[PDB]
Amino acid sequence: IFDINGEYAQAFTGIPNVKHTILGESPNVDSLEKKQQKGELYSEEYYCYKKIPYQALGFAGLIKLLRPSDKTQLPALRNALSAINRTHFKSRNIYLEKDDGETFLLYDDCRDTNQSKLAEWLDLLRRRRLKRTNVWPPFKSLATLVAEFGCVAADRSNGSKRDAFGFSNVLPLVKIIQQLAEDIRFKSIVNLNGGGELADGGTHWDKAMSDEVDYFFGKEKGQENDWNVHIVNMKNLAQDHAPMLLSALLEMFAEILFRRGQERSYPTVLLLEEAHHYLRDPYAEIDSQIKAYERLAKEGRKFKC
Amino acid sequence: ETFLLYDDCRDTNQSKLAEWLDLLRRRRLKRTNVWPPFKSLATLVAEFGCVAADRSNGSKRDAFGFSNVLPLVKIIQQLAEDIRFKSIVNLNGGGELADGGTHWDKAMSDEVDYFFGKEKGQENDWNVHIVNMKNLAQDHAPMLLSALLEMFAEILFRRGQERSYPTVLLLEEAHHYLRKAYERLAKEGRKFKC
Amino acid sequence: HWDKAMSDEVDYFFGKEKGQENDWNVHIVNMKNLAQDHAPMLLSALLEMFAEILFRRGQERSYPTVLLLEEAHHYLRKAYERLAKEGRKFKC
Amino acid sequence: IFDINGEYAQAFTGIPNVKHTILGESPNVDSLEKKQQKGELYSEEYYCYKKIPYQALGFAGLIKLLRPSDKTQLPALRNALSAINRTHFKSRNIYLEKDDG
Secondary structure, three states, rough: OOOOOOOOHHHHHOOOOOOOOEEOOOOOOOOOOOOOOOOOOOOOOOOOOOEEEEOOOOOOHHHHHHHHOOOOOOOHHHHHHHHHHHEEEEOOEEOOOOOOOOEEEEOOOOOOOOOOHHHHHHHHHHHEEEEEOOOOOOHHHHHHHHHHHOOOOOOOOOEOOOOOOHHHHHHHHHHHHHHHHHOOOHHOOOEEOOOOOOOOOOOOHHHHHHHHHHHHHHHOOOOOOOOOOOOOOOOOOOOOOOOHHHHHHHHHHHHHHHHHHOOOOOOOOOOOOHHHHHHOOOOOOOOOOOHHHHHHHHHHHHOOO | OOOOOOOOOOOOOOOOOOHHHHHHOOOOOOOOOOOOOOHOOOOOOOHHOOOOOOOOOOOOHHHHHHHHHHHHHHHHHOOOOHHHOOOOOOOOOOOOOOOEEEEEHHHHHHHHHHHOOOOOOOOOOOOOOOHHHOOOOOOOOHHHHHHHHHHHHHHHHOOOOOOOOOOOOOOHHHHHOOOOOOHHHHHHOOOOOO | HHHHHHHHHOOOOOOOOOOOOOOOOOEEHHHOOOOOOOOHHHHHHHHHHHHHHHHHHHHOOOOOOOOOOOHHHOOOOOOOHHHHHHHOOOOO | EEEOOOHHHHHHHOOOOOOEEEOOOOOOOOOOOOOOOOOOOOOOOOOOOOOOOHHHHHHHHHHOOOOOOOOOEEEEEEEHOOOOOOOOOOOOOOOOOOOOO
């Protein structure tokens, strides 16, 4: 249930194998959660707490959320995507690390340290020949990687430099991000902490949305499904920001449903109160911009959804 | 000598581009025998949109050229990181391609002849060929239908009036894709005995 | 000082906070001596300012507001979609 | 109520907590300011005064009053707004003071 008013807890009283997670403004933080075991009838106040990590949104979801629409932000975004998983951040700044141990420091106090080696630094960074990591960088990290990548140019003399005109041009993005940080909506819903494992194999991007979302729609046949209910409650929610979250959820659902398969499918219930508000984007009236809903419906018709 | 292309804003070897592009424009150089990747379409468009002589008597990859195609390359690169993206077609190429200039001629004629029956003298091992097209979403089927109709109409016109064998087409749900030059076969079915 | 300024300003316009008690119940505004091409913009600005102030009133401390503005079509040409589509949701 | 015509004052005859506000330049500055409470009868003798400071225009309403395109003109305005902590004006001049050097 994609609960919007917060009333379905009463309806399913006494049915075993249920769980309901409530999201919103807790009156008091200091609380302890109690869990329920097999066989017992499900009652209220028995659940497991789960927040919204910004990691579990999808890389394309974050890219669309940022909506890069400037002169030199998309190549910077590609450089970040090719190099954001090979960085180390400790509470003050993001710094690189090669396989040999060499590190590069990114500064925010307006110092031009090592402005001539940036050519080799970015060459090796794009070539992806550095040391890996096991921590997901925070959302604040991308605010500086794009800015630093987008102001690199070479004149007749070798090397690169950072001019003040580039800083002024990228100033709107950093300033608007800082202003949005001084608000009450983004941080109250999305948790921009940053952190997570980086299990190797070359399929991390796919596996992250493949196996982690099994918490939503179950695993392959042969397991033991103790839970059969998953509800996210947003009884207080802004109608302006709901379409973005729901579109991201649908985009995530589209790819997992394709990988769901035939023999590994279960009956599914989708609740969409006032779906007409967020089914279509305001500027997506052309039939070439709908690859989520129709594909989702086709996959569901094929494989029991 | 070679020449490297850069998808990002690398500053390495971005000075002597105008001379290379000017020499390339006269199409007097040598050809190749390798199929390029699918994603390489946008870089040539960006180069065409950015290459010029700088105002201060120079040359540089100005931001005015990359921003022209930036919205397009946004969805081009976003589509390249999709799970369903490689469930239909492989985008590597680099196979065997014998010389003769039939890159489009053979891959049109032979394939199109196979789709809609071979000519006289060739044994046909199948009569009712069923294709499980459930893997391709309805977001691109009209394009394929129109392209196939336009392709096979041209060969039918030049295949001769005597060689028009009995042919019937089965295309379910006409209401999704039936709304000139891209549906010549479907409209002029009787003209080509299809 | 922004909190101090907003606390000073929101008072006496549409009431006081939950803790305080409002003495007045009817608030008449007199704007007879002002041109018709300069007052509507200020009225719309005040409307938007009070709309954005309402956000931190939440639901526990937000007392539902009553609005009576005469001949609003001058400046009503987000501004009206949001305030009227989520108004019942946030006690408007 | 925001009475452009200021005519509802006659329509609130018999309400204990009716308060009147006047906007516009005061014809006589020497007039004092009155504070009220609950229970007092409303009449023309009693009135209250209030004005909005220029800083109360906000960050969104004022920029949307002229509602210009937010592509190239906004950065200058945001720089002017941000450069309010480094700004001085005494009679007609602009001078910048940071420290002794």
